[PDB]
Design a protein around this ligand. Structure first.
Ligand SMILES: O=c1ccn([C@@H]2O[C@H](COP(=O)(O)OP(=O)(O)O)[C@@H](O)[C@H]2O)c(=O)[nH]1
Ligand SMILES: *[C@@H]1O[C@H](CO)[C@@H](O)[C@H](O[C@H]2OC[C@@H](O)[C@H](O)[C@H]2O)[C@H]1O
Ligand SMILES: [Mn+2]
Lengths: 35, 299
């Protein structure tokens, strides 16, 4: 299994090799939508 | 008396030196067997999908729990994960790239699609089967679930409960963005939140006999719908059913939430605090708890 991608774009797994941007759900920030 | 068979199927793999899985299986199987009641002519068939090490773990656990208190007839059957993987792969290959962690197409992911092609895998003599996760706790006689087969409307092939987190709200974001007015990914009672695979009524006959269902298994149909929905996932069968469930809700008899009360709240803390309640709300007398994402089940 993989950890869900917190980003709204790219693959379903976080750190999708083919993704460069991360669009976070409202209220979250960072390369993995942390804070 | 002509013997009447009841069939359950559980995935139980990589269980050796995996104590959290064994304890889960222990909680599921003891509650199941403690509370089950079947008439004298009836037999409960417990199918396990396991590699050889887990088959042995399962046998050791089962001997401690069988025969069941209620004294009904119970038969245990094991299916080789490797044999099933090879039978599944031709049917399931093309969907793997859309619904597996992550890409592309690996044999190790094929088994997570077993339910979608279960009608081609189980012998024809088996007309129906209930596939169950092992991170469950049963609060009623499993025999009662079988009556929900009688509630299938014409065209319905599968009984399945809704997903109780906004995971599909998240997954379908781009389709939602392009279609502001869609119910796809919305909470119930009027939204289409998608499905959870922890409890599934697989009517193998109806799956075999459905022209629509057979078409949806074809590579080009899988691809057209995944394109239409911009859909990527890593939850396997759950993701495929959720997707074809958006296009063809007639295929599914939606079980009440109490038949698969999911406890996982992971998505609440990952962008969906506001809407989370609308997905997670389930009321009524609980029949099955589902401690998904390793969530302790209450006692
Ligand atoms: O190493 C594993 C992982 C999962 N499973 C089976 O696959 C099901 C789905 O996994 P899990 O319930 O952990 O996922 P979740 O319910 O959190 O999606 C489990 O209930 C088990 O029956 C298994 O046999 N071995
Ligand atoms: C996203 O990744 C997280 C962390 O790995 C998982 O916990 C999520 O799965 C959980 O929520 C959705 C349910 O359908 C799963 O059964 C449950 O484990 C995953 O979406
Ligand atoms: Mn589960």
């Amino acid at each position: 299994q993989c950890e869900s991608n917190p980003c709204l774009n790219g693959g379903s797994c976080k750190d999708d090799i083919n993704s460069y941007e991360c669009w976070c759900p409202f209220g979250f920030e960072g390369k993995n939508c942390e804070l | 008396v002509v013997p009447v068979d009841y069939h359950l199927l559980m995935m139980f793999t990589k269980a050796e030196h995996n104590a959290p899985l064994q304890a889960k299986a222990r909680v599921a199987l003891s509650s199941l067997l403690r509370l089950a009641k079947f008439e004298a002519h009836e037999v409960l068939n417990l199918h396990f999908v396991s590699e050889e090490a887990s088959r042995e773990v399962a046998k050791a656990l089962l001997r401690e729990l069988l025969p069941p208190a209620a004294g009904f007839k119970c038969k245990v059957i094991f299916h080789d994960v490797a044999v099933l993987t090879d039978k599944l792969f031709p049917v399931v290959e093309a969907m793997q790239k859309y619904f597996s962690a992550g890409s592309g197409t690996y044999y190790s992911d094929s088994i997570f699609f077993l339910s979608v092609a279960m009608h081609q895998i189980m012998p024809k003599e088996i007309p129906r089967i209930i596939q169950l996760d092992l991170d469950l706790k049963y609060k009623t006689n499993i025999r009662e679930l079988f009556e929900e087969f009688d509630n299938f409307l014409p065209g319905a092939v599968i009984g399945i409960a809704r997903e109780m987190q906004p995971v599909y709200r998240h997954t379908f974001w781009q389709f939602r963005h392009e279609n502001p007015k869609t119910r796809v990914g919305d909470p119930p009672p009027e939204g289409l939140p998608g499905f959870n695979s922890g409890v599934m009524l697989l009517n193998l006959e109806a799956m075999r006999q459905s022209p629509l269902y057979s078409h949806l298994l074809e590579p080009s149909w899988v691809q057209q719908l995944a394109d239409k929905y911009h859909f990527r996932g890593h939850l396997g069968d759950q993701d495929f059913f959720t997707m074809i469930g958006m296009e063809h809700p007639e295929l599914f008899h939606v079980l009440d939430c109490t038949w698969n009360r999911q406890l996982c709240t992971w998505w609440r803390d990952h962008g969906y605090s506001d809407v989370f309640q609308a997905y997670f709300r389930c009321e009524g007398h609980v029949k099955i708890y589902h401690g998904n994402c390793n969530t302790p089940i209450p006692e």
